[PDB]
Ligand binder design. Structure first.
Ligand SMILES: CC(=O)SCCNC(=O)CCNC(=O)[C@H](O)C(C)(C)COP(=O)(O)OP(=O)(O)OC[C@H]1O[C@@H](n2cnc3c(N)ncnc32)[C@H](O)[C@@H]1OP(=O)(O)O
Length: 170
């Protein structure tokens, strides 16, 4: 497996693997923006929705892949607001259920941080389901927990839960 930054030209190659990754992550129970009704057509639509921003460079996308087999992915959304050029949001960090516990998440976040700095972003922030494995993961990676917002979103099963806000100053 190799860590790769996705570009407009390599997007098609990774499209299916990224869609499958969202699919498996959602059905594995994670709160990443979708409900249990998620099907592959919806996952492909989500993927296609990333293409314009990836080509523009406002959204950065990485995958850890073995050829076209996508094992994990992460995204960095660069704030485009005139007064927000110091910040970026980390989103959609996901590792296939069967590829977890092997350091892929850390590999991705290390790259995300390095590239955020190249883009002169001093603040990385994100939000994740409170109490989830992701919370232990970000804490382990030295992100600082700000607090929670109750009823922020629902797990795929429809149950509302709090989201925890984390940040790291680079
Ligand atoms: C801000 C947003 O981008 S929130 C979106 C969060 N993503 C998701 O919830 C999707 C579902 N969860 C996942 O895909 C994965 O479980 C991820 C990406 C959090 C973890 O990735 P993995 O690749 O398995 O973790 P990695 O193996 O890189 O772990 C880094 C470390 O995190 C911590 N960690 C990971 N999983 C756990 C866990 N189950 N319990 C406690 N600590 C854990 C550990 O300390 C570990 O470092 P140490 O390995 O030396 O033991």
């Amino acid at each position: 497996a190799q860590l790769r930054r996705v570009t407009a030209e390599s997007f098609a190659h990774y499209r299916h693997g990224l869609a499958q990754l969202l699919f498996e992550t959602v059905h594995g129970g994670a709160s990443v923006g979708f409900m249990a009704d998620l099907d592959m057509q919806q996952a492909y639509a989500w993927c296609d929705g990333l293409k314009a921003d990836i080509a523009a460079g406002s959204l950065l996308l990485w995958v850890v892949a073995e050829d076209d087999n996508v094992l994990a992915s992460a995204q960095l959304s660069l704030c485009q607001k005139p007064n927000g050029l110091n910040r970026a949001e980390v989103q959609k960090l996901m590792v296939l259920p069967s590829a977890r516990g092997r350091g892929l998440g850390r590999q991705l976040m290390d790259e995300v941080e390095q590239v955020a700095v190249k883009h002169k972003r001093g603040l990385l922030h994100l939000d994740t389901e409170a109490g989830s494995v992701a919370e232990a993961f970000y804490s382990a990676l030295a992100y600082t927990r700000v607090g929670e917002l109750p009823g922020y979103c629902a797990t795929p099963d429809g149950r509302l839960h709090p989201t925890a806000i984390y940040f790291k100053t680079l």
